[PDB]
């Protein structure tokens, strides 16, 4: 029985197998890797275990891990450890119950309101302020890379890895490959702000091989129907979307912008987070045969 | 991608009235309405498309309906030339061109022409690959876009198509750009007449001064 297991219980913490966590559900079978919810038995805390079965560039993953390890801030998804089980590598990291902002919009089939955007963007700007202060660049700012925990706090995840894809969020100086700095995230932030308000980035309906040429040499984008938005919102988007990087506003300056500075508390996101996670629960009841 | 289709779209179409870039090849209508500033223009020669009874140009025989004024070396005309004749103008002025795809291009064996085109779909615009047949010797492009590739080379080096014009072409060209009855002279001859007509047109009617030629 467990009499055999109890004899085996005379083992140290080093001897402990990967039973340290209890896998519960497959939250999303993402292409980067199957991602499972789990609970650490000893701490009772909920973590997310990203299985990396793919023989991807494990340097591309280790580079993502090493960037994650270098960050200690509640605005950035934390990393807890890794282990090998079966044939694949499993990566334990911070759990965000609601998911990415893109899925929140998708699940509710609903665009985010202004006040919801200002709260979500204020938290992310505090994250960008922390990273830029450390002379780091996220490099992949977008709605699908901004996770919300069950409480309602936005968190940056899935750092872009410096190469050696889709351009709609890229700054002009970064696609032209003329060299870029921290304020590159400010451009993608501005595009993300549009993506939150109207569901798609500007040039989304444009082919990538086309958009690569238009974005560097065209006026900074704006709202498709700019009569639907407040002056502070349009001005904030205008100040994020400045083609000259040296002229582009920094994350610190944007935090004092009227649109962000007056952002309401996390409590406003309460209703939409309940909406999104209810569509997730029903989505899991239909895939199971029973 | 990574083929001559990239070359076509790099230069693409830019509105002359407002400096707005579109990564769109030339084809189809070719009288282009700018979405940013509502300007009508020809995608080939960048001339204004004076549509109905508004043309300031003199001797407008075609003011009644949609028309535009195009130089002789605009794609608006050279699109009708054969692929072979265009290659002759290029060779006669010793300008190299592709007949095989560039080495980096790995054309999709099922796919055809990969030039990206905006096709009208319900409730918006959707970009799709051209996908027409890619003949051998056309450098991996379709017939329509391969000619356009050649015309860009001809426009790039400001080659004069009139160097290949026939007598009728010179008589057609003489009345269109010089507003005269081009009938021959008494005491003259058919060969000296061709060289005579060619000489004034080259000396008096310049090539398109607003065609995108990349400096
Ligand atoms: Zn225009
Ligand atoms: Zn023309
Ligand atoms: Zn006219
Ligand atoms: Zn084609």
Author numbering:
A (entry chain B): 10 to 173, 186 to 311
B (entry chain C): 857 to 1071
From the paper:
HOIP, an RBR-type E3 ligase and the catalytic subunit of the linear ubiquitin chain assembly complex (LUBAC), plays crucial roles in various cellular processes, including the NF-κB signaling pathway. Particularly, STK4 can directly phosphorylate HOIP and inhibit its E3 activity, thereby attenuating the LUBAC-mediated activation of the NF-κB signaling pathway. As a serine/threonine kinase, STK4 specifically recognizes and phosphorylates dozens of protein substrates, including Mob1A/Mob1B, Lats1/Lats2, histone H2B, FOXO3 and HOIP, thereby regulating their relevant cellular functions. In this study, using biochemical, mass spectrometry and structural approaches, we systemically characterize the association of STK4 with HOIP, and unveil that STK4 can directly bind to the RING2-LDD module of HOIP through its kinase domain.
Therefore, we only mixed HOIP (residues 854–1072) and STK4 KD in a 1:1 molar ratio, and conducted relevant crystal screening using this protein mixture. Fortunately, this approach successfully yielded good crystals that diffracted to a 2.8 Å resolution. In the final crystal structure, each asymmetric unit contains one STK4 KD dimer and two HOIP RING2-LDD molecules, forming a symmetrical butterfly-like hetero-tetramer. Intriguingly, within the HOIP RING2-LDD/STK4 KD complex, the two STK4 KD monomers, each adopting a canonical KD-fold consisting of an N-lobe and C-lobe (but lacking an ATP molecule due to the K59R mutation), directly pack with each other to form a symmetrical dimer through their N-lobes. In parallel, the RING2 and LDD modules of each HOIP RING2-LDD pack together to form a unique architecture that is mainly composed of six α-helices and six β-strands, and coordinates four zinc ions. Specifically, through its RING2 region together with the β5 and β6 strands within the LDD domain, HOIP RING2-LDD specifically binds to the C-lobe of STK4 KD. Detailed structure analyses uncovered that the binding interface between HOIP RING2-LDD and STK4 KD is primarily formed by residues from the α7-helix of STK4 KD, which accommodates HOIP residues located in the α1-helix and β2-strand of HOIP RING2, as well as the β5- and β6-strands of HOIP LDD through both hydrophobic and polar interactions. Specifically, the side chains of S877, Q974 and D983 of HOIP form hydrogen bonds with the side chains of STK4 T238 and R231, and the backbone amide group of STK4 H228, respectively. Moreover, an Arg-Glu pair (Arg231STK4-Glu983HOIP) of salt bridge further strengthens the HOIP RING2-LDD/STK4 KD interaction.
